[PDB]
């Protein structure tokens, strides 16, 4: 089993072999090279509708998002191992406070992880970190981990992961914030290895809880359909092709890799479960959002306001998207805890108050409030 470890626990030899194996994968023009694998995600569009119209293959806004991306990260991993890496794609634990992106990707000189070229666009990838990036993520992820149903976890998990994409890429034209070019920035793989790790920590929690972790009773339909393009005969990877259905991608152990550990924030699995329980011993009020495709990436900010017009910051969540993305709409609410904002405005759950929403494109332009239905507010008692 190939090990994925914390980027900051990498030995200098680990780093060198990774940088080397990555340089070779990037130079490789075969179907197992970088440009080809990166294409599975956005552009060049590699999937087609029955009518010949193409769309980006990555599954977002749906329950199979973890599954689809678990296979894509594995596809890139196998290629690196094949070029000499003796270690798996390391994970960048972004739920842990950080004052800067990991060194692995920031060193400019002779670093294959600093950027990649985008053949189709004839440029290199771009990053333009937003100040918000530098905890918030711990909170967004802990709410996801608290869930005991796959579909409820998935939505919190996916929206939380979107934030890294948006705040790293920023307004840059070819970076992490575009559905089209994210997969080209090598940081995408450190981000997605961590994202796969978060799903793995959740599967261990469920196991610990005595609840289903390798199957899901919700959305039972989508989990049996194939994950394009991993199911195609043209997929040179026999492992990802063999586990190309949502149903077959739950068990990562069958994918040949493992993590150095599943200790979320220094806590063991049973400690984390005790911790999340403590959280539910408090009454909480939540804003709930119904999300669907808007054909682009957007950041949403909202304030909680007393009727008299006194407001306080409510929260922020991001949507990763772009032109030609496949249609998507979640079948449940995305929950955001606003207990604090209320307490601040000295509001009571039953007081009448407003939630003011502002949707903004990645460039900075305000998008119509028409894209999003008005949020719901509900109480979640101890
Ligand atoms: O009643 C408000 C209504 O106005 C119009 C559209 O923006 C709808 O989506 C919105 O909910
Ligand atoms: O998933 Cu397609 O991007 Cu993180």
Swiss-Prot record:
Disulphide-bridged cysteine pairs: 47-57, 151-218, 305-311
Highest taxon in the source lineage: Eukaryota
Annotated residues for binding of Cu cation A: 41, 60, 69
Region (Functional unit Odg): 1-382
Sequence position, cross-link 2'-(S-cysteinyl)-histidine (Cys-His): 58-60
Binding site for Cu cation B: 161, 165, 192
Glycan-modified residues: 51
Role noted for this protein: Hemocyanins are copper-containing oxygen carriers occurring freely dissolved in the hemolymph of many mollusks and arthropods.
Subunit structure: Decamers of large identical subunits (350 kDa), each containing 7 globular oxygen-binding functional units: ODA, ODB, ODC, ODD, ODE, ODF, and ODG. Decamer formation requires the presence of magnesium ions.
Family note: Belongs to the tyrosinase family. Hemocyanin subfamily.
This protein's name: Hemocyanin G-type, units Oda to Odg
Full-sequence range covered: 2503 to 2892 of 2896
């Amino acid at each position: 089993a190939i090990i994925r470890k914390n980027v900051n626990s990498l030995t200098p030899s680990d780093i060198k072999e990774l940088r080397d194996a990555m340089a070779k994968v990037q130079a490789d023009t075969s179907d197992n090279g970088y440009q080809k694998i990166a294409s599975y995600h956005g552009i060049p569009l590699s999937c087609h509708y029955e009518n010949g119209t193409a769309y980006a293959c990555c599954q977002h806004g749906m329950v199979t998002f973890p599954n689809w991306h678990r296979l894509l990260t594995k596809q890139m991993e196998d290629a690196l191992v094949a070029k000499g890496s003796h270690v798996g794609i390391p994970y960048w634990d972004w739920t842990t406070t950080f004052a800067n992106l990991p060194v692995l990707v920031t060193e400019e000189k002779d670093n294959s992880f600093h950027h990649a070229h985008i053949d189709v666009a004839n440029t290199d990838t771009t990053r333009s970190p937003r100040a918000q990036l530098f905890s918030f993520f711990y909170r967004q992820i802990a709410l996801a981990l608290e869930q005991t149903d796959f579909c409820d976890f998935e939505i919190q998990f996916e929206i939380g992961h979107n934030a890294i994409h948006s705040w790293v890429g920023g307004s840059s034209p070819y970076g992490m914030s575009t559905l089209h070019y994210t997969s080209y920035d090598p940081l995408f793989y450190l981000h997605h290895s961590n994202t796969d790790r978060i799903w793995s920590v959740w599967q261990a929690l469920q196991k610990y809880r005595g609840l289903p972790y390798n199957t899901a009773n919700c959305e039972i339909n989508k989990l049996v359909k194939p994950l394009k393009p991993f199911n195609l005969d043209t997929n040179p990877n026999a492992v990802t092709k063999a586990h190309s259905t949502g149903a077959t991608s739950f068990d990562y152990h069958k994918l040949g890799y493992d993590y150095d550990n599943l200790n979320f924030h220094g806590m063991t699995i049973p400690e984390l479960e005790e911790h999340l329980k403590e959280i539910q011993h408090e009454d909480r009020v939540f804003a709930g959002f119904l999300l669907r495709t808007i054909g682009q990436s957007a950041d949403v900010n909202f304030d909680v306001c007393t009727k008299d017009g006194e407001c306080t910051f409510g929260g922020t969540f991001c949507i990763l998207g772009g032109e030609h993305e496949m249609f998507w709409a979640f079948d449940r609410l995305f929950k955001y805890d606003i207990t604090t904002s209320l307490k601040h405005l000295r509001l009571d759950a039953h007081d009448d108050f407003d939630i003011k929403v502002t949707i903004k494109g990645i460039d900075g332009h305000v998008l119509s409030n028409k894209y999003l239905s008005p949020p719901t507010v509900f109480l979640a008692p101890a």
